Write a structure and sequence with these properties.
This is part of a larger assembly, with 2 copies of chain A.
Chain A (H helix, E strand, L loop, with lengths): L12 H18 L13 H5 L1
Protein name (chain B): Spike protein S1
Chain lengths: 49, 49
């Protein structure tokens, strides 16, 4: 009421959740490869090895 | 309460008032205010905002 305003964030919580889900799927299905170039699939036990 | 004439918020501002002529209670809300922002491309590109 006295001239103070709060501005909404540019990225809504849904977009942040989508970003985190994308990162998690990438790290599950492709290991560390997708962080340094094209995403290459690999079975999860072999990635754990 | 019959004795109380005004009402204050948590942050020490008036929000409710009692009419003297008729024993009624009125919620006072400040008139709308905001910031005006102008969205515009480069003036060389166009002059629409």
């Amino acid at each position: 009421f006295n001239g103070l305003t709060v501005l909404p964030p540019l990225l809504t919580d849904e977009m942040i959740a989508q970003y985190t889900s994308a990162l998690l799927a990438g790290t599950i299905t492709s290991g560390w490869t997708f962080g340094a170039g094209p995403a290459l699939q690999i079975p999860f036990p072999m990635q754990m090895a | 309460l019959p004795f109380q004439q005004f009402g204050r918020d948590i942050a020490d501002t008036t929000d409710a008032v009692r009419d003297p002529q008729t024993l009624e209670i009125l919620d006072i809300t400040p008139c709308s205010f905001g910031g005006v922002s102008v969205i515009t491309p480069g003036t060389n590109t166009s002059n629409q905002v």
